Amino acid sequence: FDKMWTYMRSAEPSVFVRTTAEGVARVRKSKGKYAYLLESTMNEYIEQR
Amino acid sequence: KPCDTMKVGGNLDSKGYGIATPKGSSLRTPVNLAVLKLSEQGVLDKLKN
Known part of the structure; x- marks a missing residue:
């Protein structure tokens, strides 16, 4: 996780998103070149949408 | 120019430049x-831009 943080905090463009919906859309539009770390609850909900 | 170089990856560390005496x-x-x-009046950001 420290290795992942080292990468995420310095990644350009920013890998951080303002809202959950923004992260979900970035995953959906990035053709698998963007993975999103989020709480299992939101993940499970979006998986059924 | 000739625009033939590129910055790759994140920064390896974080630090700062200071005026030395x-x-x-x-x-x-x-x-x-x-x-x-x-810094507070935005001069340093304008000069970098």
Whole structure:
């Protein structure tokens, strides 16, 4: 996780998103070149949408 | 130009550039305060841009 943080905090463009919906859309539009770390609850909900 | 180089990956560390004076210099306090004033008034961002 420290290795992942080292990468995420310095990644350009920013890998951080303002809202959950923004992260979900970035995953959906990035053709698998963007993975999103989020709480299992939101993940499970979006998986059924 | 010739635009043939590229920055790849994130930064390996995080640090800063500072205005330096001889140890114990009379200018140390005014120059430290001026850098903070130039920071707070947005001068440093304008000059980098």
